[PDB]
Enzyme design. Structure first.
Site, PDB file in Angstrom:
ATOM      1  N   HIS D  54       0.822  -1.127   0.004  1.00 58.10           N
ATOM      2  CA  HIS D  54       0.016   0.023   0.055  1.00 58.10           C
ATOM      3  C   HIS D  54       1.023   1.226   0.109  1.00 58.10           C
ATOM      4  O   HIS D  54       1.854   1.324   0.781  1.00 58.10           O
ATOM      5  CB  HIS D  54      -0.966   0.231   1.230  1.00 58.10           C
ATOM      6  N   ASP D  57       1.750   2.228   3.418  1.00 59.75           N
ATOM      7  CA  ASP D  57       2.746   1.259   3.683  1.00 59.75           C
ATOM      8  C   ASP D  57       4.050   1.593   3.731  1.00 59.75           C
ATOM      9  O   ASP D  57       4.990   1.420   4.868  1.00 59.75           O
ATOM     10  CB  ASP D  57       2.633  -0.139   3.318  1.00 59.75           C
ATOM     11  N   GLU D 181     -10.167  -6.472  -6.065  1.00 64.74           N
ATOM     12  CA  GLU D 181     -10.268  -7.592  -5.151  1.00 64.74           C
ATOM     13  C   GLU D 181     -11.617  -7.442  -4.204  1.00 64.74           C
ATOM     14  O   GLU D 181     -11.927  -6.492  -3.774  1.00 64.74           O
ATOM     15  CB  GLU D 181      -9.028  -7.375  -4.016  1.00 64.74           C
ATOM     16  N   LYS D 183     -14.778  -8.495  -1.720  1.00 65.68           N
ATOM     17  CA  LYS D 183     -14.992  -8.859  -0.337  1.00 65.68           C
ATOM     18  C   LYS D 183     -16.336  -8.646   0.095  1.00 65.68           C
ATOM     19  O   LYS D 183     -16.754  -7.717  -0.276  1.00 65.68           O
ATOM     20  CB  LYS D 183     -13.894  -8.183   0.911  1.00 65.68           C
ATOM     21  N   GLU D 217      -9.455 -13.283  -2.996  1.00 68.60           N
ATOM     22  CA  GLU D 217      -8.936 -13.925  -1.683  1.00 68.60           C
ATOM     23  C   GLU D 217      -9.552 -15.051  -1.195  1.00 68.60           C
ATOM     24  O   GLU D 217     -10.683 -15.004  -1.216  1.00 68.60           O
ATOM     25  CB  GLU D 217      -8.931 -12.674  -0.902  1.00 68.60           C
ATOM     26  N   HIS D 220     -12.031 -14.355   1.755  1.00 64.79           N
ATOM     27  CA  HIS D 220     -13.122 -13.402   1.315  1.00 64.79           C
ATOM     28  C   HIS D 220     -14.210 -14.177   0.833  1.00 64.79           C
ATOM     29  O   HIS D 220     -15.376 -14.234   1.119  1.00 64.79           O
ATOM     30  CB  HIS D 220     -12.773 -12.215   0.207  1.00 64.79           C
ATOM     31  N   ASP D 245      -4.968 -13.811  -3.867  1.00 66.16           N
ATOM     32  CA  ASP D 245      -4.359 -13.512  -2.677  1.00 66.16           C
ATOM     33  C   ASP D 245      -4.648 -15.023  -1.824  1.00 66.16           C
ATOM     34  O   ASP D 245      -5.879 -15.358  -1.777  1.00 66.16           O
ATOM     35  CB  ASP D 245      -5.243 -12.536  -2.001  1.00 66.16           C
ATOM     36  N   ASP D 255     -13.017 -11.545   8.742  1.00 66.85           N
ATOM     37  CA  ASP D 255     -11.792 -11.767   8.062  1.00 66.85           C
ATOM     38  C   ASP D 255     -10.578 -12.142   8.859  1.00 66.85           C
ATOM     39  O   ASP D 255      -9.987 -11.405   9.609  1.00 66.85           O
ATOM     40  CB  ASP D 255     -11.668 -10.771   7.415  1.00 66.85           C
ATOM     41  N   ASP D 257      -7.666 -13.935   7.875  1.00 65.05           N
ATOM     42  CA  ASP D 257      -6.439 -13.802   7.189  1.00 65.05           C
ATOM     43  C   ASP D 257      -5.236 -14.734   7.978  1.00 65.05           C
ATOM     44  O   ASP D 257      -4.172 -14.138   8.186  1.00 65.05           O
ATOM     45  CB  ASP D 257      -5.803 -12.430   7.165  1.00 65.05           C
ATOM     46  N   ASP D 287      -1.762 -12.787   1.389  1.00 62.78           N
ATOM     47  CA  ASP D 287      -2.597 -11.545   2.446  1.00 62.78           C
ATOM     48  C   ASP D 287      -2.757 -12.342   3.635  1.00 62.78           C
ATOM     49  O   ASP D 287      -3.907 -12.926   3.749  1.00 62.78           O
ATOM     50  CB  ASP D 287      -3.549 -11.010   1.502  1.00 62.78           C
TER      51      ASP D 287
END
Lengths: 388, 388, 388, 388
Positions: D54, D57, D181, D183, D217, D220, D245, D255, D257, D287
């Site tokens: 990101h 990030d 993406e 979700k 993902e 997701h 992902d 979620d 992850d 991810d």
């Protein structure tokens, strides 16, 4: 011609609800921190009966004794100035990193002792400000993986912890009782005592079960796709509904804590119907989060709505129950027969009765309609204000 | 170099499992009906230890006394010819239209009496063929709508029914115990005692709780998104795991009853790990449906798989527990600390201990890693046969 | 002062809905079979606009040509006698055992051809009785296990099948269009094109996409925990909402097909709000099952309720939209701003605009409340008939 | 005899994954912040092929131009020192309070422009560091309530935004493509384009659809209870799987992850099977969030596991496909027949073919077993390393 709540309706709110700053797994706070004294004042103006707190909501973690005094006194003056009460209190054992693997059931023995000690400190406070109920939400008791937690040992430690609390309480001669709040998951992958049923069953294994009951939350049971009124009725049948947390949830997903009446509206109606008909006289406590989209004006709007929807629901359910047309349909559906004993006459008489087996005409009984859809439409009509 | 099951592994199967004709909500049977005697013979050849039955599986509904005799004798000769046992039995109170609003909790009083009488008749049979456990699955106890069922009255009728069964049992001096099987929904919109927790809690309200325990099913708890091993551990802690139903389920949706090992494979592993470490010695019972895509060859393939996957899982979990590298990681993660008492020293000593609060260094404890991900990968490695 | 439906409200019902005999995965029929002609007559008296059918609902599977004639003529006379129409029709490719692994995507090539041929036969019939829409619900396209179905090949066969149907249709010069109905699961473990999104995307790969749209069902999207109005809006944005199936569902579990208004009531309101504001002019079709608890009187009660709840919802949503206080709140929440273009000025101007980045005051924009909770309470108030 | 990953396996990790500080809805960070340069170095030692980011990030929000330079250069030197690549990049439009009602679909027009501008700035950066894919996760596009968002307008704004991005890209002559993406929810109550299907369908409405695909993902799609390999196959059939992902999720809830291989293990196997057989050559991107229970040692343990489980799965699936016994079972189950055209001969020939209807023996075809359970047990055996 409205639905204005009064302190007699017994509506309460946690400090952490209207004070939620809107930080979520993916974003920073959208609202500034509220001083507890402002919240007490604002909720009272809205007609709330009282407020509830986590220790760390009232007194910031690491606070000095003389800082503790300051926070309490100020809080005390606000409650004196408004007539607001503090019927319930609870401990935060989930926010600080030290509780990352739990409080009462953390693998580390020294963490479990600290958790007990932080809880006991807050029960004395709670008692002091006059709460009658002490809630425990073990949000960090559980695991993300199978090897990390042996659940039989964890339940031994959980019981050990509640037994010690109960011993503490009786030795101090305090009047307070405990309410365990179930949640199936979040923030742990799975949480111990995940539903009302699990919580009630655990309680029956405690040293003095009479000191403990449940504080079910609308959204938490709905995170497991369960029927919340059904769970509440089992808690009432067991004489264990000590307190209740009201909010909204849209099915199985993250814990939304929407305002009460949001989420499953018909579930809301049947719940109010039940609390009202059973004669539940505990606090009507909202555990909700005003969405982070909102400013302070939307916060108070959202809190006022909690109370408004309860009252509207309350009026519609009274109307339903009182309606002669509904009382007749209930007879049509044999609810009256549900409440009579199956075999008051006793086993022996049942066994001897030919009309219960040998000469029972299964096919005619099979043919009898239950008339549940006409009844449910009458409930629909009453809810929507469309009787006619 | 395989995993062949033997009757000593205690694997059982219900008549209705391999006999499922594949009718589902949207389609006709894809398989012809099996004679119970053929099923007993075929399962024994596969190495099953025994079979279980619904009354109406063994003896067709409406059967004459002299027809009953015929069905039983024939069934008896098959069990004598194969060494197969009948460790469990149950009643069908859900298929016949007369049970459309329930058996023990139907609104109609006369239906509730009939249900008791049909159940009692089958307990005598069960006892006769030597079952030690009598299962009750109240699949029709519940509702699609809120007004149709007052749940407090329904629980009074449910208790009334189980109490009467227990009285019947003790008066006949029978050795049998009861196991209640929870399910959250299907075929009713919501079902009473929807999870293991609810079932355990209800049992504590019965006249003689020692006569009753639970028969949890893998897929049913997973229909509520719950952790099944976690639920099984709570049942073991309570001393209530009387029997268990093994199968596969892919998350929250209709009751799939896939073969055991299908669905949540890691859940399967942790369950076997737990049954094996707790020393569960009851039957390993499969409640599964060979998919309707299959012919008789796929049916026996699917049943053999149930047993095979259990054995493979059993071997991988023993390997995990026995691995010195895993025992060390468990210490690293402090599972050993989980099993020691939190405060054996007692309340007073805890309160006086400065190291539990006043001089507890929360920040160092917070800094300690739990090491759960290394542990879980070791579990992964063992499951997949990839240690190295 | 009521909500009586009229044929102008365009309410339709499938023959299989009120005709559902109440067989479910765990129980026999509780109701006798209805003659289609009786259903047409009874629904018309209730104010229905028309009925829809599966081939095998109208004409029993294996029927002789001269039996076909008889069933149709009789059905024709009933529709002439009542003014009822047949706006939609569909094929049954899921009940007969031959379809156990699917119709269009069965692994067996000869089954896929049969399925096409049975579908084509029914499109001619449908056209004849005047339907404008032909629904396809591939309830058996999918799998219980991963190796059983290669999904890329299955989608090649699915497309192949829809392309052939479209070619058939254009060559006959018929006026009919196709609507694919998504469902995520049941009766297969997983079903292909499991949601509205999947269905819309598949359609874009067809030979003549304009011939195909979607027939979403309220309960099916809710079986995946999705927002149904949100899905309907995406279908409307795409110009693909050809038909719609209305019913009730209580969250993620088996396909309940409750009467419309049951299940998620607020979802119901927002859906009606949307269909009404978009100007949806297709049929309002109920795909529901009167619960098997009911007799014929409850069946017609349940069907009447479908229509009644739609009308009540319709009135409450009009009231909401028309309310000056709500129009102001919508401005307060900036819905008006949502409908203006973000950058009509174009990319270059956006890039050059310092007020969109370089001198954008993020913090003041962050501070602005959305006012969504006051708006949603106004929606609540309108739904419940409690504005004030 | 192990499974050591190499940069040729194309394993990538987002900066925010191993850098997750463990703040969750109910608790503070348990880990200190990682410098991106340390992460790049540590992942390379573990055998990663690259990292993704990101904007916020890499470069802290509000950073000065000359601070931007510093962050990039330092990041650049680390990637030069290790051989690590940056195949993908993305924008953070969900963390800052200004995005509380969304980025591209916020109700406030000025917020939507800012979001475009922050995204465009990062595409230039991404291009510079050599990414080929640009991901968009609209985590804040959606709503908690029905009136707050008109979804047709929101989709008009979403399209407007993607079209502008595409125009920007072509005008700069950049080589990059977009991956959306999906979700279904969290952090908004409902999120727009909630699944792969919705995302693919939306893309077909864009100006230049060839520039856009999906980045699905694992967790997701599983939050909606969907079959992820099935969704991936539809994306492959559509030629839209641009990026993927990888992670773990335990059913329908928040979620999680989890590390890849955790959660649904059999889903993991079938996915790897599919990516490997289709010839997917994009990055294998994780991810995931190392659980907050862990310290830095558990973080790297958890990241290494992602890669290890992929490789183990990869080996087991190759073994399955290559096994002569499995190839025969696949023929037994007619997968070969699934891949042949249903009616290559064409519509006219199909209609004329008596063997496809008139003389089709439905009952013999119905009788044919699919043999799917034997096949799935062979898959089981291969996964567990227990062939024999």
């Amino acid at each position: 011609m409205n639905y204005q709540p009064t302190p007699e309706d017994r509506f309460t709110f946690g400090l952490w609800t209207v004070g939620w700053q809107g930080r979520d797994p993916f974003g920073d706070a959208t609202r500034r921190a509220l001083d507890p004294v402002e919240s007490v004042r604002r909720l009272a103006e809205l007609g709330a009966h009282g407020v509830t707190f986590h220790d760390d909501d009232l007194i910031p973690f690491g606070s000095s004794d003389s800082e503790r005094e300051e926070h309490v006194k100020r809080f005390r003056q606000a409650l004196d100035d408004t007539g607001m009460k503090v019927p319930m209190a609870t401990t935060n054992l989930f926010t600080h990193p030290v509780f990352k693997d739990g409080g009462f059931t953390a693998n580390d023995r020294d963490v479990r002792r600290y958790a007990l000690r932080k809880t006991i400190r807050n029960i004395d406070l709670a008692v002091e400000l006059g709460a009658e109920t002490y809630v425990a939400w073990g949000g960090r008791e559980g695991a993300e993986s199978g090897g990390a937690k042996d659940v039989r040992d964890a339940l031994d430690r959980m019981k050990e912890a509640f037994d010690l609390l109960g011993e503490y309480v009786t030795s101090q001669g305090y009047d307070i009782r405990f309410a365990i709040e179930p949640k199936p998951n979040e923030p742990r992958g799975d949480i111990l005592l995940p539903t009302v049923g699990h919580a009630l069953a655990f309680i029956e294994r405690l040293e003095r079960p009479e000191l403990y009951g449940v504080n079910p939350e609308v959204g938490h049971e709905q995170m497991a796709g369960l029927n919340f009124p059904h769970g509440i009725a089992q808690a009432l049948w067991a004489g264990k509904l000590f307190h209740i947390d009201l909010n909204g949830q849209n099915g199985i997903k993250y814990d939304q804590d929407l305002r009460f009446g949001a989420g499953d509206l018909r579930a809301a109606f049947w719940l109010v119907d039940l609390l009202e008909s059973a004669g539940y006289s505990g606090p009507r406590h909202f555990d909700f989060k005003p969405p982070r989209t909102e400013d302070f004006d939307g916060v108070w709007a959202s809190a006022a709505g909690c109370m408004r929807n309860y009252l509207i629901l309350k009026e519609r359910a009274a109307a339903f129950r009182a309606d002669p047309e509904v009382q007749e349909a209930l007879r049509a559906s044999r609810l009256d027969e549900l409440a009579r004993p199956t075999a008051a006459d006793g086993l022996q008489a049942l066994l001897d009765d030919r009309s219960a087996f040998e000469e029972f005409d299964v096919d005619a009984a099979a043919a009898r309609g239950m008339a549940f859809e006409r009844l449910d439409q009458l409930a629909m009509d009453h809810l929507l204000g469309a009787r006619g």
